[model samples]
Target: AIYLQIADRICDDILLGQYEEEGRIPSVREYAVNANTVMRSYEYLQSQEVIYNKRGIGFFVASGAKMLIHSLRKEQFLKEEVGSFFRQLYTLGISIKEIEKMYYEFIQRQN
Candidate 1:
């Protein structure tokens, strides 16, 4: 899942508008990850058409890539992240009311 996580990191940065459409991403060698890992992540993203590679040049963000990433992120957050949280709540026999109160308090603290 390292490769998947790497892909997530790039998509997260993309969503943050660090790289806009038709913008060039850093080379694989510039990443903190293993070169192979970054390459795999780029390939995965290419398959989704989030980024495209030129023959000699580096990868560039594709049009509408942010929207695609946003949709994918939302779906995964609900299915994977939220599912895990709800499962833990069920396992611990936690009440939704208690969690809601705690969540609001957490938000206030953040603010």
Candidate 2:
């Protein structure tokens, strides 16, 4: 979805620490042309209230934009990742406590 893609492009920038809250995004005109997506995607983002238009200026990232992005992403993760994984947990007969233990175990495995 262009809506999701445009958000990811902007979210990717925030994730990389490229912009602080209240920072201006480099012309979203760039996003519209390269991929040939319509301006509706930008409008969609603005509707979410994370990106705001400054009239003659341009769109600016709102405070908590990153946190908002993170929260939205977690919902996406639950929809895309955890839903299936959680469903599989029942198939595997895994209990909530077992998942907790495995979560801790998995965290340490990164080290």
Candidate 3:
């Protein structure tokens, strides 16, 4: 029940920089023993190629892992999010210059 939940929390921890690059994650087999979380999920996560292993040493995070994830999401966004966004914008007569101004304002607000 908590296996995937625990796995997700570790993903969040990784994203938030709670663990530094090349930091070893504690063995989840032992960690989950008392934590009431699932262990198999970690196996799934590792097998998906998110984390690194070093035989006897333990696991480490890849440098720039978050950026790699971001790049994957951007491709997905262009395929999924952007198409509908552009369609609605076209319907509303939005254009490149308008989008550029809006994007500029959006970035400024975020900063």
Candidate 4:
């Protein structure tokens, strides 16, 4: 869960273009408060390839990170929530066709 939150934070930044084309991110201590987690959150981002370190300098968002994070968030959402929700509905006797219709409706409503 902590890793997910960290990923979300970085994803948000990527969407906001905070790290455009090699822009450096704030120090771990700076993100410590921003992410509201331990210093390990930054490390988690590093391990996930969402960001990279610069030796003496702080971290910077890596190239391709925006797309990477976007895909990861989609996978996480489906795996962590949507899949379970559909499974529960099926267990409650919902038909697969009904689930598909409802899923399509849900996505339509999102737009």
The list of candidate 3 runs beyond 4 A from truth reads 1-12, 29-44
TM-scores for all predictions: 0.71, 0.78, 0.63, 0.72
Report the C-alpha lDDT of model 1 over 29-56, residue by residue, as the tens digit.
8775278777788877888778887899
Highest-lDDT candidate: 1
The lDDT, on a scale of 0 to 1, for candidate 2 is: 0.73
Candidate 4 residue-wise lDDT at 40: 67
Scored by CA lDDT, what does every candidate get?
A: 0.81, 0.73, 0.67, 0.72
lDDT for position 78 in model 1? 90
- Which sections of candidate 2 miss by over 4 Å? 31-35
90 in model 3: Cα distance from truth in Å? 1.9
Better of 1 and 2 by TM-score: 2
RMSD of each predicted structure: 2.7, 2.3, 4.0, 3.0
For candidate 3, give the lDDT: 0.67
Per-residue lDDT of 2-110 in model 2, one digit per residue for the tens?
A: 6666757676577566877778776756654464454666666677666788879776787778887788778778789888898898899989998788888998878
List of clashing residue pairs for candidate 1: none
After aligning candidate 2 to the native by TM-score, how far in Å is the CA of 71 from where it should be? 1.7
Worst 10 residues of 2 by lDDT: 29-38
lDDT of 1 at 74: 77
What is residue 27's positional error in candidate 2, in angstroms?
A: 1.2
